[PDB]
Design a protein around this ligand. Structure first.
Ligand SMILES: CN(C)CCC=C1c2ccccc2CCc2ccccc21
Lengths: 351, 351
């Protein structure tokens, strides 16, 4: 037999469970596949890499030992064998290169999760590869009818909240999905009637979604460095679709992007303007909001599900002083999130 | 007519007002005294630079390339011209670049005042150069007696809290001064009975004190960038004496230094492990305490003026994954500072 699932859902399955995507991703980070193939990648290898980053974090603040900073930077490339050709490997000596690497490792973690879930579970040849992988995702994925007003709303969300400055592309909705991950309905219960609930985007690289649908969105591991993530070890969302759409890291080769809508229990937002690395919040606040100059228009806010959907146009909130152009909201407890809709998108680049 | 004041107070006045020390301190910041002499300084000149730093802060955080950020780095040097040997103008393009040039302007502002005071007054050849300048400070400086228990309290507090990581030099007390700025006790009235009030170290470069005694301690202006300081714009402190003493920035060429002892209404503390650039606390909080790896023994505290004087030996606090070797405290409200003692110290080096 062959799969009897909806056709766009099948396409989605072959997208996130894609080997050549995974091998290509490691090459984008200029990694030696001969010394380190996809098979020999592991979970703790990365945890160790994270500790190397945590080491450098401490090394910079806790005194001035720039000698060691090299030896650890060099040790990183030993841990994760790269192949730049003739070019110099970028020195890990500051906040930029630190931040740079954690994002890779976060992706590497998700690829290990994906390939482990691919080789995980059961051998059943009499079924189809698609049905098998679907059942491994632990997620009911329904195609949303493009008529349904929720779709129209979703379109009006994306349509308006494309920011002007991110001019390199423009967007359109290929496929929408009503995902339901097993357990998250119960996990989200304690924050269900917490005040100030907003539907927000989470953008991510195609392949990660295998891990993002099986295990949900997670906080960085204990090994990870807090300085590597601007606001710290939480989970990052945006109200503008373009902001998250950049975190799809779409290319000319890979123009199709996946992005999520998610119900987040924010409540009392620790309103901030600049970087502030932290593991936990003060007694009172339940989340952070990085305030940006541009923002979705507040008068155009609405309520589907009894939840806020700010889909107004980008307007200049009179925000004196900020490192961020656009807004972003961050919660630091994984239960505070409930995922709703997954959107396959098309990035048509300009010339 | 010669002065009525004590010898120690006279040598103190001279030291801070020594113009040649100011001229000298500006050279350490690579300032060109041809294009930017001491006389040609002004308040807005420096505040204009702060705005341009604040503009780079964003340029840096958003990863604008070396060809783009070029213009902003030269814009800064345009305002404040520098003496670069025979070099090309060094590119300002990271956190430290900012942090370094931020701590510069602080001084430039504090030095401006000193030069502004020497000149902004009435001269009189009959009256003493010193006494006239003592008037300018608006401070009732009194020489502490060597025996009085308060002297012996300070001696031990200084004696014990010299950190092992800063042992390249070793300090000894020369002079101690009980001080009271005019009106400063009026400012403290609301906070004088607040819970958790401590006496803490605050050491700045010799040349700044004129402005500190005149204006009181000060937070950075509105124009300044928040990312120039580890915990944003405020009033920093320390419970370890060597830590604060390092910002006197003494050397073999200038082994004389000054350092303060201010009462601080910490109250409810927002404890933190890592860099958190802010200009406003979470509600309920009054001060910030950086969680140090090392702490003055909790059981070795005593009361003077009903204030918590922390003068124990150095021990491990028992904190994992922190960026601070020792506690540094930051209040974000001028009103929560009251100055009590100013010490003159010889920095005896191990050359
Ligand atoms: C003139 N006044 C306002 C100086 C402020 C106080 C300090 C200081 C002193 C002791 C411990 C920490 C800090 C914080 C950092 C810092 C950086 C540069 C210059 C001074 C300072």
């Amino acid at each position: 037999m062959k799969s009897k699932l909806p056709k766009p859902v099948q396409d989605l399955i072959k997208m996130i469970f894609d080997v050549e995507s995974m091998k290509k991703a490691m090459v984008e980070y200029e990694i030696d596949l001969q010394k380190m193939p996809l098979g020999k990648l592991s979970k703790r290898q990365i945890q160790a890499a994270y500790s190397i980053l945590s080491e450098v974090q401490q090394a910079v603040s806790q005194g001035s030992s720039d000698s060691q900073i090299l030896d650890l930077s060099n040790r990183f490339y030993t841990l994760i064998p790269h192949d730049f050709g003739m070019k110099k490997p970028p020195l890990l000596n500051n906040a930029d290169s630190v931040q740079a690497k954690v994002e890779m490792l976060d992706n590497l973690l998700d690829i290990e999760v994906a390939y482990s879930l691919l080789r995980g579970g059961s051998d059943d040849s009499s079924k189809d590869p698609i049905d098998v992988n679907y059942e491994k995702l632990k997620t009911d994925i329904k195609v949303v009818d493009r008529d349904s007003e929720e779709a129209e709303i979703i379109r009006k969300y994306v349509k308006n909240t494309h920011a002007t400055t991110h001019n390199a592309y423009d967007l359109e909705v290929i496929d929408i999905f009503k995902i339901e991950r097993e357990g998250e309905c119960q996990r989200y219960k304690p924050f269900k009637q917490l005040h100030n609930r907003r539907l927000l985007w989470h953008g991510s690289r195609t392949t990660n979604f295998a891990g993002i649908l099986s295990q949900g969105l997670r906080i960085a591991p204990p090994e990870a460095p807090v300085t590597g993530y601007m606001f710290g070890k939480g989970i990052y969302f945006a109200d503008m679709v373009s902001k998250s759409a950049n975190y799809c890291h779409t290319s000319q080769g890979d123009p199709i992007g996946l992005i999520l809508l998610g119900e987040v229990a924010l409540g009392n937002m620790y309103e901030l303007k600049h970087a502030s690395h932290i593991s936990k919040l003060p007694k009172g606040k339940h989340s952070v909001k990085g305030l940006g100059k541009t923002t979705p228009d507040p008068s155009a806010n609405i309520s589907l599900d009894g939840v806020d959907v700010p889909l107004g146009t980008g307007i200049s909130s009179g925000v004196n002083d900020t490192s961020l152009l656009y807004n972003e909201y961050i919660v630091y407890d994984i239960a505070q999130v409930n995922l709703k809709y997954l959107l396959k998108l098309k990035f048509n680049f300009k010339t």
